[PDB]
Amino acid sequence: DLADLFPGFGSEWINTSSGRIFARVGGDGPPLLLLHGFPQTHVMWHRVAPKLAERFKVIVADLPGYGWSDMPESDEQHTPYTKRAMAKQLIEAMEQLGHVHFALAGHDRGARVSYRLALDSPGRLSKLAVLDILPTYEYWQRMNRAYALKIYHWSFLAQPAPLPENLLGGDPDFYVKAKLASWTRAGDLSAFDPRAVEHYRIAFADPMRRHVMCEDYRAGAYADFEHDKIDVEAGNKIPVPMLALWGASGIAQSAATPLDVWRKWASDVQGAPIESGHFLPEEAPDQTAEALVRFFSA
Template sequence: MAGSDPFLRGFQLHDVDAAGIRIRAATSGSGPPLLLLHGHPQTHATWGRIAPQLAEHRSVVALDLRGYGDSSKPAGGEHHANYAKRAMAADAVAVMRALGHTRFAVVGHDRGGRVAHRMALDWPDAVERLAVFDIAPTATMYARTDRAFATRYFWWFFLIQPAPLPERLIAADPEFFLRTHLEGQSRTPGSTPPELFAEYLRCYTSEGAVHAICEDYRAAAGIDLEHDAADGDRRVAAPLLALWGARGTVGQTYDVLETWREKATDVRGHALDCGHTLQEERPEAVLAALRDFLG
């Protein structure tokens, strides 16, 4: 499919083959390449308030991760390995190479940040710079889980339950679940306008989407932790920017910079006055931070 992106002004939509996985990509701009990776329950449309400005000076690619948006939703496979962050990172690298980008900066929010972290370890020659939004490392968050975190991030423990329990419960009222999730994480009323919510709901209720999302979380609680443990002594070599919401769970639960200094050699960053979805809640502050970091 090709056409204009209704949510990212000036971007064109493409379906790119990544070793048999169809990945929806939106592209615009010229100059140094920049990859944008969304989180749950968003799609690439989450970047609508910052991607056009970034594309004024860069070749910007925004993807729907496998299992999300209009990308393929394969079966989870043994140990949920098809939704390991390693597999999702491989998709993104394959797309960037197909578009002619062998080395690039990457920005990841939420799940996309976890994919970007794995990418920086598995493909260090591809990742020039890395920015992660409102996350601490996955293994750190699981290892330091307490009642407060488990209460506020209940879906980390709900979505990983064996199929089809969470899938069937969400299917009973997906709009209520999605709206409750988004409103619970944002600290900026109106930051997800009705037309953007409608797009998220369209994708969330598409065939196979909820199961794929559950597989993403099941992988994070299993095979991803195995991969992280195997790389326990390795650190990300690329410069890393961590941004987080001062009013969100991650910012109020962890020393975010310290958690990333345990995983990377060159770390900087700061909090923004918002909740979880920085690029929707505080787009101008995010743009300023990225322009300073990316150069």
């Protein structure tokens, strides 16, 4: 019994060669794909997608393996949950809608899908927005005591199965709520819509879903990092005009500005802090929506 947090939006099951993508679709105008991250689902956009739906066809997609999207069978390399493979799957999903050139905003894992998409297939993107991430390579290259403690879950969830799966099963409700709360500015669940939290909680209550999320982070520690590394060493930069938003108290933020990081990764990047923790579209939807609307409006 989950709430419909996108009234007026349609519900689409988009067939891909790797399984269905679930999407809420609303609005008209240029296509804009919105990708959620961990440990959420598409419903994390529920406060900003209506604002975007004023000017765009907004596709609010569950990542491969997340939410109501099918979970592709993983392999030893976690291939389907590498950002390269998710980007390819979402490109195929977007093609099923006849969208071969689209705007993309991603948050957290979905933002990693999104910059990887921009690196692999920049022709697919009109403009890219990434919310509160640095490239996965940068997290791993900056790995030190302080970051290891802050994003312990990057190493914890990347442990070989079934260690994180089994530990996550010890208190999945506590864990997903602890993640949501601890990454907000508030430090509790008060920034979230209780109906959205229920979406996240139900998704996280499913051990197969939790395993996918670990596959995602295992990809994030290995193949995703390797893919990123190849780009850094080749000097490959995202040519897609890009917006990098981050929470003043979000994950990506540190002394050195996330914009300065992305400038090494993107030829055309503007950025701005949002007074927010990690969950920009829910902790600060008005500031987030306006930033995206302003950046994507063309």
